[PDB]
Design a protein around this nucleic acid. Structure first.
Ligand SMILES: [Cl-]
Ligand SMILES: [Mg+2]
Ligand SMILES: [Mg+2]
Ligand code: NA
Length: 326
DNA sequence: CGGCCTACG
DNA sequence: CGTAG
DNA sequence: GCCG
């Protein structure tokens, strides 16, 4: 009744198993901090299955036959059903390793490998990192300076104001170019921790060279607190009553021939896209990325004019963005 | 057992 | 190494 | 950690 890949089922943003999924996601996150990508994937997939169920799990019986529920994930759910807490989850939550790796990897410019090295060196707090700035890249310095603002979610209201400023710069850089909101906000989130925009132009080729022209214009408007092509990972100044705050914004350019693939990829969720690419390759023998869908036997790229085309190519029922919250 | 998404900066 | 979803 |  429940298919094995997340791209085969609808997953809404809000659901009926929030506490269970959150606990499994703690274990997934902790597996990532230890470099166990396989365990991370299993716990993420198990959490996602619960998000896709039509009602709450109330009894252990109800996990029988669900994909990605084995001894370990079932025990976690069992303990939550019986006691309201899972001892393993709570031990992770309180652990110095989990808490420090979570804090450090939240910094823009710091991944698991850097966080782990700092942890092994004995560093534990952001102020520890600030006291050794020669150990930091320019990107990490910006991430550390702006960390407090970047830790506070932005609202859809904020997103709409940002989009107008990006559109103004894009229109000067290339008249006729368009700006599409992607990421979690396109999946229906009312808040989120960064904003993603996808930029194209209806005449194939006209988008070449566009992103530098857009960045220069936003920089000259004083809106860019940090930037480093077709992807730009920025920190922008967002107005606030009587002041402003830093916000992470990603800007991506695609040619219109690739736009449906880029839209699909950048709309996420992350798990949904990994699952969709896995399904494409393993079940259909086709290779998917944010630029296209390749048949390696015929050595040809599928043309798509819409996300609907891509789901059809892959033999999957169409899911709107709001149902891609795997 | 092998596999676990696939890119760009 | 970082970033993205 | 789980699936095929
Ligand atoms: Cl693993
Ligand atoms: Mg996002
Ligand atoms: Mg983003
Ligand atoms: Na980070």
């Amino acid at each position: 009744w429940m298919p094995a890949y997340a791209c085969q089922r609808p997953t809404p943003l809000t659901h009926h198993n929030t506490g269970l999924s959150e606990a499994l996601e703690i274990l997934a996150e902790a597996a990532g901090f230890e470099g166990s990508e396989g365990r991370l994937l299993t716990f993420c997939r198990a959490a996602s299955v619960l998000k896709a169920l039509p009602s709450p799990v109330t009894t252990l019986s109800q996990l029988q036959g669900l994909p990605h529920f084995g001894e370990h994930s079932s025990r976690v759910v069992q303990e939550l059903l019986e006691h309201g807490v899972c001892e393993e989850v709570e031990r992770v939550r309180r652990s110095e390793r989990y808490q420090t790796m979570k804090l450090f990897t939240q910094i823009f410019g710091v991944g698991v490998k850097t966080a782990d090295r700092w942890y092994r060196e004995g560093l534990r707090t952001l102020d520890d990192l600030r006291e050794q700035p020669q150990k930091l890249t320019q990107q990490q310095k910006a991430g550390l300076q702006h960390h407090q603002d970047l830790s506070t979610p932005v609202l859809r209201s904020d997103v709409d104001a940002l989009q107008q400023v990006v559109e103004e710069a894009v229109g000067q850089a290339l008249p006729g170019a368009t700006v599409t909101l992607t990421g979690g906000f396109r999946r229906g989130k009312l808040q989120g921790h960064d904003v993603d925009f996808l930029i194209t132009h209806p005449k194939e080729g006209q988008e070449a060279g566009l992103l530098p022209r857009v960045m220069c214009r936003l920089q000259d408007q004083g809106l860019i607190l940090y930037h480093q092509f077709e992807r730009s990972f920025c920190i922008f100044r967002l107005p606030q009553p009587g002041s402003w705050k830093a916000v992470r914004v990603d800007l991506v350019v695609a040619p219109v021939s690739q736009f449906p693939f880029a839209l699909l990829g950048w709309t996420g969720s992350k798990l949904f896209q990994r699952e969709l690419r896995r399904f494409s390759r393993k079940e259909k023998g086709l290779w998917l990325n944010s630029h296209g869908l390749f048949d390696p036997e015929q050595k040809t790229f599928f043309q798509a004019a819409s996300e609907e085309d891509i789901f059809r190519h892959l033999g999957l029922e169409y899911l709107p963005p709001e149902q891609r919250n795997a």
